[PDB]
């Protein structure tokens, strides 16, 4: 309810100061690209990217009064979601929408792409990527918007204390209005650019479902390819994202 | 898990 003359930035600034900063991957360029050594080296960039996640998420405004078992649940999910995104927002401001911008030590470049195994979902990313600059969004737009990814996908059988999650998850979505709310006072436009932000965030979902079934597969004949494993890694994809895959855990799509 | 519910607190 931003209204009057002042209030409301509170919120708008956590986001900005606890957004973690750069990280790299420990991925060496200047050795012949193979399979190998590239799934290898994106596999230990998640393992560092999920150590920042974790930080970034207890520092979220009320993520601390969800319970521990679901907020270890919760950030176990969404990881991929979030991580595509944070990562697409690197890929605009930085090479303009034209590689995937992983880690400054790694750069996805067409060839890459096609020696990674996974040109395909590449793609996908690359264009959730180019979208940011078709729908010109805004650092407090993305800011807010990867929030929300956070708390955008449960197991349908229910957390261990639903009502917190949901009123969280609540409060997020209005947020998000209340920085789309804030150029120009007309129900209109609003309901526009609403609209467009929350289709993109779903359209998340699909891309990260789609890299899930990758790393599984990948992890299941891991030893075979050679491509080494994060001892918390391999973890969460042998038990947490499986059950993505089983059906017992379900993104939350606004739309249909 | 068990490597990770350390950092969470
Ligand atoms: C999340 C990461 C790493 C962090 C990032 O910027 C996005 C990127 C998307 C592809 C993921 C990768 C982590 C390692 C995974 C999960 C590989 O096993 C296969 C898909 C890879």
Redesign the interface.
């Known amino acids: 309810h931003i209204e009057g003359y002042e209030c409301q930035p509170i919120f708008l600034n956590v986001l900005e100061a606890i957004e973690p900063g750069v990280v790299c991957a420990g991925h060496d360029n200047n050795q012949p690209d193979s399979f190998a050594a590239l799934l290898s080296s994106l596999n230990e960039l998640g393992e560092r990217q999920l150590v920042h996640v974790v930080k970034w998420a207890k520092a979220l405004p009320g993520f601390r009064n969800l319970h521990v078992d679901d907020q270890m649940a919760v950030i176990q999910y969404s990881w991929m979601g979030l991580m595509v995104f944070a990562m697409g927002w690197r890929s605009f401001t930085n090479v303009n929408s034209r590689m995937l911008y992983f880690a400054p030590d790694l750069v996805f470049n067409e060839y890459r792409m096609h020696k990674s195994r996974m040109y395909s979902q590449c793609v996908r990313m690359r264009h959730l990527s180019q979208e940011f600059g078709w729908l010109q969004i805004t650092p407090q737009e993305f800011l807010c918007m990867k929030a929300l990814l956070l708390f955008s996908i449960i197991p349908v059988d229910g957390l261990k204390n639903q009502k917190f999650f949901d009123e969280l998850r609540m409060n997020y979505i209005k947020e998000l209005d209340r920085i789309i709310a804030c150029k120009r006072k007309n129900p209109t436009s609003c309901s526009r650019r609403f609209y467009q932000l929350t289709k993109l965030l779903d359209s998340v979902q699909p891309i990260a479902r789609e890299l899930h079934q990758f790393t599984f597969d990948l992890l299941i004949k891991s030893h075979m390819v050679s491509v080494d494993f994060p001892e918390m890694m391999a973890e969460i994809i042998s038990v947490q994202v499986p059950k993505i895959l089983s059906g017992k855990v379900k993104p939350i799509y606004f739309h249909t | 898990?068990?490597?990770?519910?350390q950092?969470?607190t």
Do not use: F, R, Y
């Not at chain 2, 898990?1 to 519910?5: Q, R, S, T, W």
């Open positions: 898990h068990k490597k990770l519910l950092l969470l």
